[PDB]
Structure formats: C-alpha cells, structure tokens
Design a protein around this motif. Sequence first.
Motif, PDB file in Angstrom:
ATOM      1  N   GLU A 137     -22.629  38.250 130.763  1.00  0.00           N
ATOM      2  CA  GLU A 137     -23.104  37.391 131.879  1.00  0.00           C
ATOM      3  C   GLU A 137     -24.252  38.082 132.624  1.00  0.00           C
ATOM      4  O   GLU A 137     -25.222  37.406 132.981  1.00  0.00           O
ATOM      5  N   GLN A 138     -24.119  39.365 132.944  1.00  0.00           N
ATOM      6  CA  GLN A 138     -25.112  40.042 133.808  1.00  0.00           C
ATOM      7  C   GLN A 138     -26.401  40.214 133.020  1.00  0.00           C
ATOM      8  O   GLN A 138     -27.489  40.088 133.627  1.00  0.00           O
ATOM      9  N   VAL A 139     -26.298  40.476 131.717  1.00  0.00           N
ATOM     10  CA  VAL A 139     -27.481  40.660 130.825  1.00  0.00           C
ATOM     11  C   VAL A 139     -28.178  39.300 130.718  1.00  0.00           C
ATOM     12  O   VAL A 139     -29.431  39.232 130.849  1.00  0.00           O
ATOM     13  N   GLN A 140     -27.394  38.239 130.550  1.00  0.00           N
ATOM     14  CA  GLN A 140     -27.936  36.859 130.451  1.00  0.00           C
ATOM     15  C   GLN A 140     -28.727  36.534 131.718  1.00  0.00           C
ATOM     16  O   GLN A 140     -29.863  36.064 131.587  1.00  0.00           O
ATOM     17  N   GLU A 141     -28.169  36.804 132.902  1.00  0.00           N
ATOM     18  CA  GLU A 141     -28.829  36.496 134.198  1.00  0.00           C
ATOM     19  C   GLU A 141     -30.184  37.197 134.249  1.00  0.00           C
ATOM     20  O   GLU A 141     -31.189  36.526 134.556  1.00  0.00           O
ATOM     21  N   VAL A 142     -30.231  38.501 133.980  1.00  0.00           N
ATOM     22  CA  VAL A 142     -31.507  39.280 134.044  1.00  0.00           C
ATOM     23  C   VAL A 142     -32.504  38.710 133.028  1.00  0.00           C
ATOM     24  O   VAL A 142     -33.709  38.610 133.337  1.00  0.00           O
ATOM     25  N   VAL A 143     -32.061  38.389 131.818  1.00  0.00           N
ATOM     26  CA  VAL A 143     -33.005  37.888 130.781  1.00  0.00           C
ATOM     27  C   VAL A 143     -33.545  36.503 131.188  1.00  0.00           C
ATOM     28  O   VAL A 143     -34.734  36.257 130.980  1.00  0.00           O
ATOM     29  N   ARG A 144     -32.728  35.646 131.801  1.00  0.00           N
ATOM     30  CA  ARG A 144     -33.183  34.306 132.252  1.00  0.00           C
ATOM     31  C   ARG A 144     -34.186  34.458 133.380  1.00  0.00           C
ATOM     32  O   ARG A 144     -35.190  33.769 133.355  1.00  0.00           O
ATOM     33  N   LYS A 145     -33.891  35.284 134.375  1.00  0.00           N
ATOM     34  CA  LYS A 145     -34.549  35.152 135.690  1.00  0.00           C
ATOM     35  C   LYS A 145     -35.807  36.006 135.793  1.00  0.00           C
ATOM     36  O   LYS A 145     -36.583  35.749 136.732  1.00  0.00           O
ATOM     37  N   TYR A 146     -35.992  37.009 134.933  1.00  0.00           N
ATOM     38  CA  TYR A 146     -37.061  38.028 135.124  1.00  0.00           C
ATOM     39  C   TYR A 146     -37.913  38.100 133.858  1.00  0.00           C
ATOM     40  O   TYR A 146     -37.389  37.994 132.728  1.00  0.00           O
ATOM     41  N   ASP A 147     -39.212  38.248 134.084  1.00  0.00           N
ATOM     42  CA  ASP A 147     -40.258  38.278 133.037  1.00  0.00           C
ATOM     43  C   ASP A 147     -40.388  39.717 132.528  1.00  0.00           C
ATOM     44  O   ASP A 147     -41.496  40.229 132.482  1.00  0.00           O
TER      45      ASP A 147
END
Lengths: 201, 201
Positions: A137-147
């Motif tokens: 979940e935490q890896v998914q959030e960072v990959v979605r939200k940040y370039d």
Amino acid sequence: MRYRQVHLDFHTSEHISDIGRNFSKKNFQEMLQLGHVNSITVFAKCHHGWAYFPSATNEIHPRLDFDLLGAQIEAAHEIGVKVPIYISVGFDEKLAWEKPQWLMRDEADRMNWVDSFMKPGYHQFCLNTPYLDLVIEQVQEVVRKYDGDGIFLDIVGERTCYCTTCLKQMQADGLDPHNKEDVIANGRRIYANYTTRIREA
Amino acid sequence: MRYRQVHLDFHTSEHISDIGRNFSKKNFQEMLQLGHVNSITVFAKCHHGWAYFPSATNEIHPRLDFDLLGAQIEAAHEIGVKVPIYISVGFDEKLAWEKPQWLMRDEADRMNWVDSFMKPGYHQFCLNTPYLDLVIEQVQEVVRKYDGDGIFLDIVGERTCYCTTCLKQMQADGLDPHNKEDVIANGRRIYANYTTRIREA
Ligand SMILES: [Zn+2]
Ligand SMILES: [Zn+2]
C-alpha cells in the motif's frame, strides 16, 4: 543511468522539531550544483517509519508541516536532476512499537538489529506477516502521487525467521522449524514473494 | 469453607484427542466418595487456553465434543459436593501464539516462564494490555452460565513488565522505565486494577 548520484539519508527522530524549516528550493539547487550532482535519491519513508509527505497510508513525521518529498522532486527536476525515492521496508520503528508481533525472531526469540526496546536502534519486520500488505500500500501511494525516477527499497533480503507467524506456517506446510535448511528455504520463498508483489504493484 | 477439597488440574494439549470420552457421572461420583471429597475445583479454562464448555468468548478444546464443565458441576452437586471453577489468567498458550504483543517482557525482552516459542512451556500475558478486557469477558461468561461455588484465578500477582504497552504508558505518565522502583509501582497499580475489575464484573 546517471554517473553522479547522491543517496540523501533522512532517518529523523520524532523527538526533533521544525523538520525542513530551513529547506529552500534555492539552497537544495545551489548545493546540487556545487556537488555536480545529476541524481539524488530522497526519502519518502525512513527507518523511524515516518513519511516526508502528507501520506494517507503512513503518518507524516509529526514535526513536519509541508510536503518535503514534493518540494525536493520539484527543486531537483527544475535543474535537470533525477530523483529516485527511498522507502525503508525492513525498518518502521514507530510501527515496531505498535506491532511487535510482526517483527523477526531468531531461534531464541531475539529481535535484530537490536535485541530489546530498552536499547537504541531498529527492529526488523518479517515480510511473511501482514506488514507486507502495508508495505505494498505505502509503495503504491508513493508511486501514484510522486513523479520520482525510481524506488530504492531498504533493509531487505533472504532471512531465517522463527516469529509466531513463520513457526505456524512452517508447521502447516509440513516444514520442520528445527531443521535449519527448511527455515532457509522458507525465507527464500518469503523474499521472492515480497519482490514479486512489489514488481506487480 | 469445606475441609476436604481437591484442586482438579486439567492443563490439556490441543494435540490429545477424545477429551472426556471416558468421563461419566457415575465414575466422577464414585471417586469423590472413595476420596471423602466435599469440594472439587474444576476447570473452565486451562494454561493451554482452552475452555471445557461450549464457550462464546473463548474456544472449546478442539477435541472436546460436550460440556465437560457442566457435566462435572451437575455430577458433584447431585451428591452434595461444591465445585469452585478454575480460570487460567496469566496463561492462555493458544492465544499467546496469536497475540504475542500482549505477553510480558523483562528489561532484555525475555518472556516468562519460558523465553522462546521453540521450547515447551507457557508464556505469561501482561494485564496492562487489552488481554485484561478478554479475561473479564471470559470470567463474566463462566459466572453467568454455570452454577459454580466460586472462582480460582491462576498465574496472577504484582509483576515488573517492560512490554511495548508498559514502556509507552510509563513514558506518558512521566515514569522512568530505567528506574526499577517506578516499574515495581506501575505493576502494583496494574495488578490492583485487574482485581478491582474482576470484583466489579
Ligand atoms: Zn517471520
Ligand atoms: Zn506489560
């Protein structure tokens, strides 16, 4: 792959105040230029377990007031510097205090790297536990939200673990926890399962 | 208070089958009479953590098919023998495997009585944790449902505990976990809080 990288550590205690108060786009860019740096790995999540962005799947450092991760990616990208993003996997010390049942154990019930909470240092999580689902979940959030320009995942590898989850699972799969080979092979599967779930997410 | 009591232990492994299959009202009564017994403390919950009745707040021994606790109270009461009921508090080994975060820890992170799960023996719960709420529920169920002549609560007393819950709570109350006196006094409050909640329930 760029030749001139910096790995910018940010393991930061909850007991230090005014996180990022002296950060500036100007200072970050001047020092990258002074260093002839063309890539800098910056932190989304440190060993202490805090996020350096206003996270929904993890808690921001309680003394950080703004999106430090976001500000660093922008400042670097605006001068042509790539920014891979760092996530501590094996260590999340503020979660260690809430979920000690998910920590690695040796044959004699010892945590690593440090064998109690009454001494300073970090306590490693077992990726054979539901902690793995929280990491994804935490890896998914960072990959979605940040370039970002990539992910660096820290404190991982093939382990031998004798935690309650591992001992029950080994017994149910007909493995023998008293057989070192069986526990080593279990840990090979546990690690491969983690890297397969990261690549798919 | 009756002069001729028996404390009838029933710490029984999940790995033994046909629990109670050779029980009979006739055998239980004949042996109480052979022994001139006028009170027998029988088990609702053992160190292994199983109930000996079809419990809603705890799991019946997985190899017991009938209400053994109920059958024992009836068999004894029908020949004028009182039956106090035993509940293991400090030990619940089948819960220990699911909720190791609620177990006691010393300064060096050691469980008691046995310092790992890779050795036989029991692991003591800390009553400063939500395990206390589960104990009260289970004590309440036995007191409601069974016509017992009292409750015997086992593996309890003033402890010194350095579990994650205790260390956080001590720090938040301005106590010093490195001060032995502070931890002893904390444990006096923890134990008094347990016996006060039992008497009120
Ligand atoms: Zn494990
Ligand atoms: Zn405790």
